[PDB]
């Protein structure tokens, strides 16, 4: 039968133009007062998935 | 496409048992035992093609020693004397001459003694 997407992974990664995946940074949900503005500002833009992790993401997202 | 194994299996077992002829007991009759015996015989034969070259040289040297000492010189001085005299006969031939042509061997000893003197 069809492979099933890991639906939780689909909610957290998006495929980019050259085939990588963009994701949202961790550590920006709460406990925010004690964090420096510089640290928080650098966590706001999306980032790419690292090389060691691409294999895990691709396995979860066969129809990405 | 079911495949029965009998004809090919029989040929394989027979090929091993044929190589086991002359072995004792189950070693020439029983496939499990004959297979191990055929493998071990192959291992020994590989090892002993190398050992054969050692054992024969050891035999030639012993006979040259005896013949040299009959002529009044040790093996080690005889070989050194031949090398100083530029004689390149090898030990297989020196041992052959030592047994079959004692007069020629004496001539070789004299050649070795002269180069040493």
């Amino acid at each position: 039968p069809k492979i099933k997407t890991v639906r939780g992974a689909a909610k957290r990664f998006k495929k980019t133009g050259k085939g990588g995946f963009k994701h949202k940074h961790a550590n920006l949900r709460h406990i925010l007062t004690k964090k420096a503005t510089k640290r928080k500002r650098h966590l706001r833009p999306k980032a790419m998935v690292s090389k060691g992790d691409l294999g895990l993401v691709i396995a979860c997202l066969p129809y990405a | 496409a079911r495949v029965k194994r009998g004809v090919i299996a029989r040929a394989r077992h027979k090929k091993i048992l044929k190589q086991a002829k002359g072995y004792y007991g189950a070693r020439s009759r029983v496939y499990r035992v004959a297979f191990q015996a055929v493998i071990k015989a192959g291992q020994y034969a590989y090892r002993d093609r190398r050992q054969r070259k050692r054992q024969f040289r050891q035999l030639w040297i012993a006979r040259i020693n005896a013949a040299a000492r009959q002529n009044g010189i040790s093996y080690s001085k005889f070989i050194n004397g031949l090398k100083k005299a530029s004689v390149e006969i090898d030990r297989k031939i020196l041992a052959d001459i030592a047994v079959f042509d004692k007069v020629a061997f004496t001539a070789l000893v004299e050649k070795a003694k002269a180069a040493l003197a």
């Binding site: 939780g8 909610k11 990664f13 994701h23 949202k24 961790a26 920006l28 895990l56 979860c60 | -």
Partner: protein, 144 residues
């Protein structure tokens, strides 16, 4: 050319691995699985994304965004598609009739991709700045 003189191209028919058929094959005994452990077992192996129990990557990262229903009914049109419609007028219906956009598309945008060389009339679509230049330069016109 007979049924017993035809051959496949070289390299087109590689033989499959056959595990567990003797020393000489290179895959005897353990069949490439190594020794023991969960991955050597029949049916063994961990699920996708499992990392040994550490919070896996797809759960230590946060969810983001929402999915837009309007994006599913919007399409993009290339300049090379404009000559493919029947009649020289490009609108939502004539793009659907030529199989350029899906039957449930309600909004379409022409973008600068490929070339247009014939005069066309675009009606009821959005056109990018670069595509509008290329369409008019080829003798066409854009009607809102």
């Amino acid at each position: 050319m007979r049924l017993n003189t035809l051959s496949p191209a070289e390299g087109s028919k590689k033989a499959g691995k056959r595990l567990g058929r003797g020393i000489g094959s290179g895959l005897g005994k353990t069949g490439g699985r190594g020794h023991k452990g969960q991955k050597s077992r029949s049916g063994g192996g961990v699920r996708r994304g499992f990392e040994g129990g550490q919070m896996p990557l797809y759960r230590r990262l946060p969810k983001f965004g929402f999915t837009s229903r309007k994006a599913a009914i919007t399409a993009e049109i290339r300049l090379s598609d404009l000559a493919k419609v029947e009649g020289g007028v490009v609108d939502l219906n004539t793009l659907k009739a030529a199989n350029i956009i899906g039957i449930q598309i309600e909004f379409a945008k022409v973008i600068l991709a490929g070339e247009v060389t014939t005069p066309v009339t675009v009606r009821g679509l959005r056109v990018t700045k670069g595509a509008r230049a290329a369409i008019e330069a080829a003798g066409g016109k854009i009607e809102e």
